[PDB]
Every structure is written in structure tokens, then in C-alpha cells.
């Protein structure tokens, strides 16, 4: 943080700027930012909107956990003490690649066993090889829907000059019913609408009027950086600010070229760092959270979830301009974003084959009704025996339920075609997410309305020309369009077991996931004795605790 | 028509005006309006938007049939000659009560056997006991989806003065794929969006630009009566005119007290007579067809279906003001409408009993996937042996599949609670329509977002107060809200077999229907020797034709 000034945000330190390939070069700071998480179960907790919730799971007694702040090249260490009654836990660091530190990913039944309750602990330590905005959450089923969530801000350079960094701005769905009850509900029923949408942890109740709108004070004439996150379990958001444009400087944790838009689509898990110029008249302006796609990717019972953007020195109160409804994004993220640091892949060479195809299908023949299958199999990870235990014991007999897609290719690009139930009854859009990598969104089926139920299968005769291998969007989460397909690509530079799943909590609970066992033969040697011992320590403590649990495992575990 | 002038539309003739009970008093004009319907099957037909359709079934070689225009009291006589290749037919007169003329209703497998093809004929004769706007269509499955539709205009008095009667304005969904192929698609798949939406038999293709917008010429300063109809197979419309208000003077074929609105919801089969005042600046204005209810009750591949309303003396071309999007009606018709001629019913005396409760359920366990059941049974009428045949032969052993809800009540109000799959995975909105009557809409479940998946079961403690029995909306079509309930009421004044079904073509084909066999004992004695002979004649000709038909019956028949 030497040469980083408001006028020159492109610079950071010697050898490190916005054009430096962050996936291969990282600043040697030697600084460690430590945090302690205390997961406690609170019954009959008073919510931000005046409504009392039956049960919540909280980190350090707050709605969200600590705002993790570190610099590019720092090491983030977190001790997670589980003081919940029955539930196990883990903390997944979404957007953190976890380069050669696979066992710190937090994916239950994959990279670790769940940390046992009644005082169980584990200390996560990872290097911040990427700068930007990210988030953390539990990976114990849909436990993060109870409140085990928070934000990660790794400071670094930018693709546009700005004066003030307003920090994190998480927008999430809010349900009065607990996550485990909602997983049981969605197994046999269609997903419900949210009761409210929280902006920076606050929202107003549409029935009573209680609570408060989020208040962001803008300094007149200054460029402000705002880090918008979607920490939701199901809801996909469309965000807009009345009489203002937002300039995207980053998509997820990948800095992109300046892209000025009127509105932004945020899928579950997606982040967007924007530059907002306080260029308009001194007044209060509404920041609106709308829903497009015709309820194909969510909705809220709060008809107008909003936040207030207040200009400093201007009068207070509620904004008078209700605004103009934004463009219907049709449950799709923009593929116009072009990364600052480029990547190139041959797209003409692609051929649709079974070992590169991941068909997402909805099975309505079994018990329960909503069972999501990827390649004819719904994922069901083993909390007692993770995929890493198999790696450490030289065991290759992975169960069909673990959905292991073994990628043996070394440091090469791998192409993946994900099909969204073309022959099925109906289709829903899916926020596809990959652990341990930022993928290249090469292409998707034609942008059509989400509830249209229009189908598209990959036809090389029209679609090979629709792909872009010259600096395509690089991110950790993107939309799988309803009724169609999606083409992705990631370079195998990080040996480990990585989940690739839909980020809608109900869908991943239903089974929408695969496990990319990347370079298994290379993985075993890269695991330190410290990580192995600790992996085995937590698994032993969990295997001892499980027979005393009064509740069963109703879902996938992921 | 004697005293019906632009300043006094309330008057009609001696003893007949807007306040007279049309349901029990009718003018004796002694005049008859005759029409001959020639149903031809046209392959590779050129559509209004430029697209060539595989097959269509048309009356007298046009997009719609002729506009049946008669006065109140006149008798409408129509000879339907069936020159189709394979299909049987009938023409149902929607909105027309058919007072003591049950055998002219056109409901196949209920009131008649289908008129055979290759020259089969039958003459329908019915008295114009009601005035206002209505429509007619085929009742041979979803055959009307191929183009066997048309409008009915029975002139009479109105509830507000106007100068010009612009006539009928039929708005319908338009599909490139034929009806029988769509019934087959919807049996196992979710209904698709319409390819386009025709307004008065015309539209512009959103991809090519071929075709024309509907052009209505408004005269400056004069009050214009517009008769808006929704003749769709699935699509439910929201209609609005840029910079103008619409003053509703009639809901279906029931005249209502003046009600000014900015927008109107029209369910499948709904009509609305509005008065548009040409009180704005001389220009071209857009008439917009929008979709609310977040695609719960339809949508279109044409993002903006519209018509042009040109003021006489103004310049030509397309309207420059795109306008502001209207309010989301959430797939619900307005219940604020109050009929001119009132009706009063006790709503406090209502008790939910199995013999007054009609549960709508979607069965997903059998083959095909989408099978709609009412009270545990999906309707399946017998084209070869109709309900009237059972009445004429003294046979009371009505099949389970005929869904006979026998109402013995003589000239008394009957209350029906229709439930919308409260315990099911998902629930869709249903435009409930009744034959031979105009029902009283006493109440429905609390108005909530259409695809919110909020459920409501009738709870006497909070719902009995929510009902209205003092001049409630009287019409033949209304919305059964998604996940809720609907309380209807009709006076048993017309003995006969009457269909009560969802008007979405695909849903009635799936089985969403019951048959109100009203006053059986009174019915046999009220059937004329001419109607009995015609019925048997058409049934003998159809039963003789059927074994030669190369296609089977894949749906309900309704
Ligand atoms: C009333 O007249 C209608 C007009 O002829 C009859 O509809 C026809 O019914 C037959 C039998 O159900 C259909 O044939 C079936 O079609 C489906 C789907 O094929 C269609 O789509 C594919 C793909 O786009 C295309 O390749 C075909 O050419 C078709 O367009 C097949 O899966 C079945 O095996 C079978 O071939 C006709 O398609 C349908 N025609 C139309 C224009 O609707 C109807 O049966 C008559 N009703 C009665 C009871 O007489
Ligand atoms: C993690 O801790 C949560 C919180 O206690 C556990 O959730 C609870 O799970 C039980 C059993 O699935 C739920 O009970 C069920 O309640 C419904 C009524 O809603 C009833 O019909 C069923 O028969 C059953 O008794 C309970 O509602 C639910 N609590 C909440 C607030 O979500 C969860 O089981 C724990 N997970 C594990 C595997 O330890
Ligand atoms: C959002 O937060 C901002 C603070 O960051 C609130 O703005 C503050 O609003 C008050 C009035 O509500 C302003 O004070 C007033 O100043 C006038 C002029 O001197 C005086 O006559 C009044 O008696 C009062 O003191 C205050 O200046 C302003 N703060 C800043 C830094 O501009 C705003 O009210 C909050 N919005 C909501 C809805 O809570
Ligand atoms: C952005 O969020 C704001 C605040 O949530 C939204 O403003 C709200 O807009 C609705 C109408 O769109 C207002 O309610 C309406 O009030 C009128 C009475 O004037 C009534 O006739 C309607 O039935 C409805 O109840 C609401 O009062 C207003 N909030 C405030 C405090 O002014 C705004 O609409 C959102 N902007 C967009 C484009 O989504
Ligand atoms: C009522 O119907 C009219 C006619 O269909 C609608 O006008 C149309 O509005 C759309 C979008 O609002 C216009 O398309 C847009 O064009 C611009 C470029 O000109 C493009 O950047 C957008 O992506 C979009 O394609 C369209 O030109 C316009 N039609 C014509 C011929 O003027 C109107 O929006 C409807 N009103 C409402 C409130 O529904
Ligand atoms: C999806 O499942 C199918 C079936 O299990 C897999 O297809 C087989 O792939 C192997 C190569 O790994 C081929 O040798 C077989 O011929 C394929 N089966 C057939 C007959 O289609 C496919 O690999 C799986 N996809 C992934 C990547 O998980
Ligand atoms: C609906 O479209 C029809 C055309 O099919 C219109 O009727 C024609 O109107 C023109 C101009 O008034 C006359 O010259 C023709 O003789 C009419 N033909 C018919 C069908 O009789 C009709 O006016 C349109 N309805 C509205 C109000 O827009
Ligand atoms: C809608 O129809 C009217 C005719 O009633 C058209 O208006 C005429 O347009 C011409 C050429 O633009 C003018 O010279 C005349 O003065 C207009 N006559 C009238 C009736 O005032 C109008 O152009 C049509 N709109 C479209 C787009 O077809
Ligand atoms: C719906 O089906 C149910 C069950 O077949 C019918 O309920 C029966 O109604 C008769 C007449 O009132 C009673 O004698 C039986 O005791 C009822 N059985 C039950 C379930 O309690 C009901 O009548 C049907 N509803 C309609 C209007 O068709
Ligand atoms: C966690 O927080 C609870 C509630 O404040 C407290 O009682 C407990 O001692 C804490 N546990 C640890 C070890 O931090
Ligand atoms: C978000 O809320 C926090 C309260 O913990 C506040 O300090 C911060 O400024 C808010 N962020 C903005 C500017 O929206
Ligand atoms: C935005 O706000 C300014 C300040 O009040 C106002 O003058 C302007 O008209 C608004 N912009 C729009 C949408 O017209
Ligand atoms: C691999 O794991 C399975 C599942 O626990 C076990 O039954 C089997 O014995 C193991 N095989 C090896 C090679 O250890
Ligand atoms: C119906 O119209 C067709 C096509 O014009 C014609 O061939 C046929 O003779 C007509 N049938 C009758 C009896 O009108
Ligand atoms: C009455 O109808 C049923 C059903 O079609 C039939 O089985 C029975 O024979 C009929 N009764 C007579 C004698 O007409
Ligand atoms: Cl009718
Ligand atoms: Cu995540
Ligand atoms: Cu992740
Ligand atoms: Cu999903
Ligand atoms: Cu994950
Ligand atoms: Cu009808
Ligand atoms: Cu009808
Ligand atoms: Cu229906
Ligand atoms: Cu009908």
C-alpha cells in the first residue's frame, strides 16, 4: 500500500500493479490478520425488521460475522469455535482460490469433516493471492441461511481511480423460517419468496413499517467505490440507483475493464465492485433491489426493498423520486465484462463428448419430489468420510453419490458443457459456482426470457461461432440459463477436490453438485503434515460426536 | 332501438332499459339473425405477422368468424357445416346463458355429440336474453386454438353515455404450432410463451417487422365505447392506453356501474366494455398488452404487443411515447365492479362441506405428467355418449370421468368453494368459467404475488368477514388465485348439464372441469322434440364416422 493514491489506483507496490498476473505472483508481506468466530445458537432473536425469528446461528452474536480486512499478499487466519447445540460446521471462503491449500476450503464431506458442536474447533489459514471483494459462509447444508455468513475485503489495486472506498455492501434474502425447515419444505415444494431483503444487514418491514433503510453517505463530487455482494440462499437481484450510473471495476474477485451500466444483475454468490460518482444534485436517492426473469430466479414479499443513498450536507429523510423500473435482466449475468489481466483459449476446437458434458436433470420419480441430478446422480457427500480421506489412504473407490469427475490433466485448460434439462418438464436458471478456481465463461445458450421455457441443445453448426475465447468473463459464479446450456473452462493449476454446484441452497441440498477431483496423483504430496493431522483430528472428534446427534441427515450435506 | 341516443344510452325501448332485470325479462322483436359457418382446414396458411402456419381451422376462410351482430331480444341462428378433414366440432356461445336451451350450448360429450366432418351440419338457435359483448369458439378440445373463434355483439343499453361504438376488439395469443401439438406438448411440459399476440386479428413480427399494428381511429372530443375481449388459449392480458384512462361500463355480459381505471386485467374468456374519452392532445397513442403476475398466467415472445390509437386529423406513423409500464395485476381480475341490476345473497350462513367444496389438484404420479383433477378426478367426456343421452334414456349411472356434480336445488342460490391445490408442490392461477350462468364472486384468498407460492385454506374465523353478498361482481369468468380459494354462487334457474372449467385450453384438456347437472328431473321435460331429434341425428352421424377417424382422443374432450 505504497503508491496507491486516489489519482493512481492502478499502482500498489514494487512489481505489483493492476496488470500483474495475480494467479501466479503474490506480495510477500509476512502479515497475518487473525479473527475468532464463535458460532452460537440463539433462539427467539430480534431481527432487523422488528420480526422475531424462531432460531438463528450467529458468529460473535451478530447478524453477520466480522468484516475480514487484509491486503494483497497477507495471510488470513481464523479460529472457528462451534458452540451450536447439534449442528456441525465449516467456513467456506468463496472467492478464495485456496492455492495448494485444498484442506482449508471448508467443503463438508469433501475437504474436511464438520467441526463438532459443544465447543469443537479448527483454525483455517490461507494466503490472499487475490484482491477484491469476496464472502464467507457455512457449508453445513444450508446452515448459512440461519446467519453463519460474512464478508471478505482483500485490499489491492483497481482498474479506475476513486477517492473513497465505502467498503462492503451485502444484499441478502431474509426468511423468518429457519434453513433446515426450508430445506425440508423445498424438497417437496417450489421455493417460496423471501420475507424481506436485507441491505447491509438492515431492511424495513412492508407490513408494520419497523426497522430502518440502509444509509450510505456520499460525499458530493467524489468517486466512491462500492462493493456489492449477493450473500443470499436463493434470491437473485437486480440493483439500480436512481439518477445514477454504476461503473463496474470488478466482477467477483477478478478486476475488469471499466463498464458503465444503469443496472446490475447479481446472482447468488456474485460480487460487483462499482465506482459511483456523486455527480448529481444534493438529495437522497433510492438504491433499488428489483426482480426480473418473471420469478424464475426469486422474488420477495417486500415489494420494494430499498436503501437510501444520502448526499453529505443535503437534507434528511426518505427520497422523493420513486424512479424508473430497470431493464429485465432475465435471470442472466452480463457477459460483456472483460478482465484487466487477459487469458486465451481455442474455442473452435471444442467437441461435445460425454466426459466433458454435465447434464443437470430434475428427477420427479422418487422420494422426495425435488431431487436434482447432475449426470444422472444427485450428490450425497459423506460427513464421516470425506474425499480427502480417500486421497490420504490411497483409496480410489469413490461412491457414485460423491459425483467425482476426475481431471488428470496437468496445468491444461479443460472445457465443460453444462446442459440445463433440455428434455425435462420445465427448467430453472442456476447460479453455477466453482470452488478453487475462476472459470472462463466461453458461452451460453441465446439470451431469451427465463420463464419462456424455450429449449436449446448445443449445436456446433450455429453455436461454435457464438463462443469467445479471446479474454472472456473470468469469475467464480455465473448463470446457467433455463432450458439451455453453458460452456465453461478452467486451467488445472490447483490440485484438489473442488465442488462445482448451484449456489441456490435448496438446489445444492437437493443434489445439484459434482466434485472435480483435480490432479489426485499430485494432491497427496502437496498436503502438509499439519493439515493432515488436523484433518484427522477433526474427523475423529466428529465421528465420535455423530452417534449422539438426535437429528438425521435429510439432504446432500453440501 | 327507439330511445337509444348518444346522450341517453340508459334507455332502449318501452319497458326495457339498463335497470330492468335482463335475466327474467326479454324484448319480443320477432327478428332473427342468420349466419352460416363453413369450417375449412387450411394447410400452409399465411398469417397476419408474415409467418406461414402448418395448419389452421377457419370459419369462412378468415382469421376469425363473422361478427354476429343482433339486438336485445333477437334470435341468433347459426348453421355450422363441418368441412374439416378428421376433426369433429361444435360452437360454444360463451356468455350466452342458453335459458331452457341447454342442447345449443356446444359442449361436446355434454350437450351434444360433435358435428362430423366432410360435410356434417347442425343449426344452433338461441335467444338474445342478454346484451353486451361476448364471443364464440369451438369446444372440440383445443380446436379453437387453430382459429375457430369469433365475436358476439348483442346491442342493448349501457351504464354511461357515449357517441361512437367502435365495436369488438379481440385480443388473443398467437402460436405458430397447431393446437393438438400444443395439447400434446403441455401434457408433459410447461406451457410455452406465445409467438405473438394478435390485436383485432393482426400484429407485427418482432424478428422480421412484417405485418401491421391494429389501427383504431378516435374522433377528437367524442366518447368511444370499446369492447375488449380476451379470446386466448392460455395468455391472460393486462391492457392500458398511453396517456388515457378507461371507464368500464361492462364486465363480461353484465353491465356495471362506471369505474375509471388506468389498466385492466383480462383473464382467458373475459370481456370488458370500456368508454375511452378522446380528451388528450391530437397524436398517435400506444395500446399496450403487458404481462403481470410474473409469468404465472402466461407471456409472449413478442416483448411489446401493441395497437395504435390514431386521433383523426393527427399525423400518421408510429407513436413516439413508449409510456410507463402499468401496475402488476398479479393474475387477478378486479372485484371492484358492481353490476347495475343488483343481487343479494347471505354470506354469513356459509359452511365448508364436502358437497360444496371443489378441490383442484395437479396429479404428477401417472402418465401423462400434467393431469388436472377436480375432487380427485380428471374429466373425460364421451363424444359418443353425451350427458344429455343419459337424461333422455332415463339412465342415472353417470361415469366417474364425467365429473357430475348433481344440484337438485330448485331456483335457489348454490355456493361453491373452489380450492387451488393448497397441499401441492406448486399452484398456478386458474380462469374459472361457468356455462349457462353468470356467477356471483363472493370472495377469494388474500391478493398476493401470483408466483409467491403463498397458500391459503378457508378459515371461517378470518374469511367469513372477507366475503361480500351485497351486489358482488356478476360474470361468467373469474380468477381462482394460485394457492388459494374462490367462493362462487349461482341461482339454479336453468335446468341442464353445464361445464364449469378452467378456460386455459391446456388445463381443461388435462382434466380441469366438473359438470353441473342442474335439475335433472326438470331437464328431460323441457327438451323440445326438435332438439331431441337433432341431438340423436348428430349423434348417429358422429358414431358412424368415428371408427373411420385415423386419430385417437388424447385428452379430456373438453
Ligand atoms: C384433429 O385434427 C388435427 C389436425 O390433423 C389432429 O392433430 C394431429 O394429431 C396427430 C396425432 O396426435 C399428430 O401427429 C403426432 O404428432 C406428434 C408430434 O409431431 C409433430 O411435431 C414434430 C416435431 O416438431 C414433427 O416432426 C411432426 O411433423 C409434427 O408436426 C408425434 O410425436 C406423433 O407420433 C404423431 O405423429 C399431428 O401432429 C396433429 N396435427 C396437427 C397439425 O395438430 C387431431 O388428432 C385431430 N383430432 C381428432 C381426434 O380427430
Ligand atoms: C441443525 O440444527 C437445526 C436446528 O435445531 C436442526 O433443524 C431442525 O431439524 C428438525 C428435524 O429435521 C426439525 O424438526 C421437524 O419439524 C417439523 C415441523 O416444522 C416436523 O414436521 C418434523 O417431524 C420434525 O420434527 C426442526 O424443525 C428443525 N429446526 C429448525 C428451527 O430448523 C437440524 O436438524 C440440525 N442438523 C443436523 C443434521 O444436526
Ligand atoms: C442518513 O444518515 C445521514 C447522516 O450520515 C442523515 O443526515 C443528517 O440528517 C440530519 C437531519 O435529519 C441533518 O441535520 C439537520 O441539519 C439542518 C441544517 O443545519 C438543521 O436545520 C436540522 O435541525 C438538522 O440538524 C444532518 O446534517 C445530516 N447529516 C449529514 C452528515 O449530512 C440522514 O438523516 C439519515 N437518513 C435517515 C432516513 O435516517
Ligand atoms: C425503490 O424503492 C422505493 C422505496 O421502497 C420505492 O418507493 C415506493 O414506491 C411505491 C410505488 O411504486 C409506493 O407505494 C405506493 O404508494 C401509492 C401512493 O402514492 C399507492 O397508490 C400504491 O398502491 C403503493 O402503495 C411507496 O410509497 C414508495 N415508497 C416511498 C417511501 O415513497 C420505489 O418504487 C422503488 N423504485 C423502483 C423503480 O423499484
Ligand atoms: C407499448 O408498445 C410499444 C410498441 O411495441 C412499446 O414501444 C417499444 O418499446 C421498446 C422498449 O421500450 C423499444 O425497443 C427498444 O429500442 C431501443 C432502441 O431504439 C433498444 O435500445 C432497446 O433495447 C429496445 O429494443 C421499441 O423501439 C418500441 N417500439 C416502437 C416501434 O416504438 C412500448 O414500450 C409499450 N409500452 C409499454 C409501457 O409497455
Ligand atoms: C457422465 O456419465 C457418463 C456415464 O457414466 C460418462 O460417460 C462415459 O465416459 C467414459 C469416459 O470417462 C467413456 O469411456 C464411456 O464410453 C462413457 N459412457 C457412455 C457409453 O456414454 C461421462 O464420463 C460422465 N461425465 C462426467 C465428466 O462426469
Ligand atoms: C377491427 O378490424 C376490422 C377489420 O378486419 C375493422 O373493420 C373494418 O373497418 C374498416 C374501417 O372502419 C371498414 O372499412 C371495414 O368495412 C371493416 N370491416 C369489417 C370487418 O366489417 C374494425 O373496425 C376493427 N375494430 C376496431 C374498433 O379497431
Ligand atoms: C391509421 O389510420 C388512419 C386513417 O384513418 C391514418 O391517418 C391518415 O394518415 C394519412 C397519412 O399519414 C394522413 O395524410 C391523413 O390525414 C390521415 N387520415 C385521418 C383519418 O386523419 C393513420 O396514418 C394510420 N396509422 C397507421 C400507422 O397506419
Ligand atoms: C367430492 O368428493 C367427495 C368424496 O367422494 C364427496 O363427499 C361425499 O359427499 C356425500 C354427499 O354430501 C356425503 O354423503 C359423503 O359423506 C361425502 N364423503 C366425504 C368425503 O365426506 C363430495 O360430495 C364431492 N364434491 C362434489 C361437489 O363433487
Ligand atoms: C462464545 O460466545 C458465548 C456467548 O457470548 C459465550 O458464552 C462463550 O463463552 C463463547 N465461547 C468462546 C470460547 O469464545
Ligand atoms: C454498512 O454498515 C456498517 C455498520 O456495521 C457501516 O459502518 C458501513 O458504513 C455501512 N456501509 C455502507 C457505507 O453502506
Ligand atoms: C434526478 O434528480 C434530479 C435532482 O432533483 C432531477 O432534477 C432530475 O429530473 C432527475 N432525473 C430524472 C430521472 O429526470
Ligand atoms: C475405501 O473406502 C471404502 C468406504 O469406507 C472402504 O469400504 C474400503 O475398504 C476402502 N478401500 C481401501 C483401499 O482402503
Ligand atoms: C366451404 O368453403 C370451401 C372453400 O371455399 C368450399 O370448397 C365448400 O364448398 C364450402 N362448403 C359449403 C357447403 O359452403
Ligand atoms: C347406462 O349407461 C351405462 C354407461 O354407459 C351403461 O353401462 C348401461 O348399460 C346404460 N343403461 C341402459 C340399459 O341404457
Ligand atoms: Cl357461457
Ligand atoms: Cu459461496
Ligand atoms: Cu466457493
Ligand atoms: Cu439451482
Ligand atoms: Cu460450495
Ligand atoms: Cu369460452
Ligand atoms: Cu362457456
Ligand atoms: Cu387452469
Ligand atoms: Cu367450456
UniProtKB/Swiss-Prot annotation, chains A, B:
GO BP field: cellulose catabolic process; lignin catabolic process
Gene encoding the protein: LAC1
Classification lineage: Eukaryota, Fungi, Dikarya, Ascomycota, Pezizomycotina
Quaternary structure annotation from Swiss-Prot or TrEMBL: Monomer.
UniProt protein name: Laccase-1
InterPro entries (UniProt xref): Cu-oxidase-like_N, Cu-oxidase_2nd, Cu-oxidase_C, Cu-oxidase_fam, Cu_oxidase_CS, Cu_oxidase_Cu_BS, Cupredoxin
UniProt note: pH dependence: Optimum pH is 3.5 with 2,2'-azinobis-(3-ethylbenzthiazoline-6-sulphonate) as substrate, 5.0-7.5 with guiacol as substrate, and 6.0-7.0 with syringaldazine as substrate.
Keyword Nucleotide-binding among record annotations: no
Organism superkingdom: Eukaryota
Function: Lignin degradation and detoxification of lignin-derived products.
Record note on cofactor: Binds 4 Cu cations per monomer.
Matching PANTHER family: LACCASE, MULTI-COPPER OXIDASE
Disulfide bridge positions per record: 3-11, 113-539, 297-331
Ranges that cross the membrane: none
Species this protein is from: Melanocarpus albomyces
Amino acid at each position: 500500500p505504497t503508491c496507491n493514491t486516489p489519482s493512481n489506483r492502478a499502482c500498489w507496490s514494487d512489481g505489483f500493479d493492476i496488470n500483474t498476473d495475480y494467479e501466479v505472483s503474490t506480495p510477500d508481506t509476512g502479515v497475518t490478520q487473525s479473527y475468532v468466530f464463535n458460532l452460537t445458537e440463539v433462539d427467539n432473536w430480534m431481527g432487523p425488521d422488528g420480526v422475531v425469528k424462531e432460531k438463528v446461528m450467529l458468529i460473535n452474536g451478530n447478524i453477520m460475522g466480522p468484516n475480514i480486512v487484509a491486503n494483497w499478499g497477507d495471510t488470513v487466519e481464523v479460529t472457528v469455535i462451534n458452540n451450536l447445540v447439534t449442528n456441525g460446521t465449516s467456513i467456506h471462503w468463496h472467492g478464495i482460490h485456496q492455492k495448494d491449500t485444498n484442506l482449508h476450503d471448508g467443503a463438508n464431506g469433501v475437504t474436511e469433516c464438520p467441526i463438532p458442536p459443544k465447543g469443537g474447533q479448527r483454525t483455517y489459514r490461507w494466503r490472499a493471492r487475490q484482491y477484491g471483494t469476496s464472502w464467507y459462509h457455512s457449508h453445513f447444508s444450508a446452515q448459512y441461511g440461519n446467519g453463519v455468513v460474512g464478508t471478505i475485503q482483500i485490499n489491492g489495486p483497481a482498474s479506475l481511480p476513486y477517492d473513497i472506498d465505502l467498503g462492503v455492501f451485502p444484499i441478502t434474502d431474509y426468511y423468518y423460517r429457519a434453513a433446515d425447515d426450508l430445506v425440508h419444505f423445498t424438497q417437496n415444494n417450489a421455493p417460496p419468496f423471501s420475507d424481506n431483503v436485507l441491505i447491509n444487514g438492515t431492511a424495513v418491514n412492508p407490513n408494520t413499517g419497523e426497522g430502518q433503510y440502509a444509509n450510505v453517505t456520499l460525499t458530493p463530487g467524489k468517486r466512491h467505490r462500492l462493493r456489492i455482494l449477493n450473500t443470499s440462499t436463493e434470491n437473485h437481484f437486480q440493483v439500480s440507483l436512481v439518477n445514477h450510473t454504476m461503473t463496474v471495476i470488478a466482477a467477483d474477485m477478478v478486476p475488469v475493464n471499466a463498464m458503465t451500466v444503469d443496472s446490475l444483475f447479481l446472482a447468488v454468490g456474485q460480487r460487483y465492485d462499482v465506482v459511483i460518482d456523486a455527480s448529481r444534485a444534493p438529495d437522497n436517492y433510492w438504491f433499488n433491489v428489483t426482480f426480473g426473469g418473471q420469478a424464475a430466479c426469486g422474488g420477495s414479499l417486500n415489494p420494494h426493498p430499498a436503501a437510501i443513498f444520502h448526499y453529505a450536507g443535503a437534507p434528511g429523510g426518505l427520497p422523493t423520486d420513486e424512479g424508473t423500473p430497470p431493464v429485465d435482466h432475465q435471470c442472466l449475468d452480463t457477459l460483456d465484462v472483460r478482465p484487466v489481466v487477459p487469458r486465451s483459449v481455442p474455442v473452435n476446437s471444442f467437441v461435445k463428448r460425454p466426459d466433458n458434458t454435465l447434464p443437470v436433470a430434475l428427477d420427479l420419480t422418487g422420494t422426495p419430489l425435488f431431487v436434482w441430478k447432475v449426470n444422472g446422480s444427485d450428490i450425497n457427500v459423506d460427513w464421516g468420510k470425506p474425499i480427502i480421506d480417500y486421497i490420504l489412504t490411497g483409496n480410489t473407490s469413490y461412491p457414485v453419490s460423491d459425483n467425482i469427475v476426475q481431471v488428470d490433466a496437468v496445468d491444461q485448460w479443460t472445457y465443460w458443457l453444462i446442459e440445463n434439462d433440455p428434455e425435462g418438464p420445465f427448467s430453472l436458471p442456476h447460479p453455477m459456482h466453482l470452488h478453487g478456481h475462476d472459470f472462463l465463461v466461453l458461452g451460453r445458450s441465446p439470451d431469451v426470457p427465463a420463464a419462456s421455457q424455450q429449449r436449446f441443445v448445443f449445436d456446433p453448426a450455429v453455436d461454435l461461432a457464438r463462443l469467445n475465447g479471446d479474454n472472456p468473463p473470468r469469475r467464480d459464479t455465473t448463470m446457467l440459463p433455463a432450458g439451455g446450456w453453458l460452456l465453461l473452462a478452467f486451467r488445472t493449476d490447483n490440485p484438489g477436490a473442488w465442488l462445482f454446484h448451484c449456489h441456490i441452497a435448496w438446489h445444492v441440498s437437493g443434489g445439484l453438485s459434482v466434485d472435480f477431483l483435480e490432479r489426485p496423483a499430485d494432491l497427496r504430496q502437496r498436503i502438509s503434515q499439519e493439515d493432515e493431522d488436523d484433518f484427522n483430528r477433526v474427523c475423529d472428534e466428529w465421528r465420535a460426536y455423530w452417534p449422539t446427534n438426535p437429528y438425521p441427515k435429510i439432504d446432500s450435506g453440501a
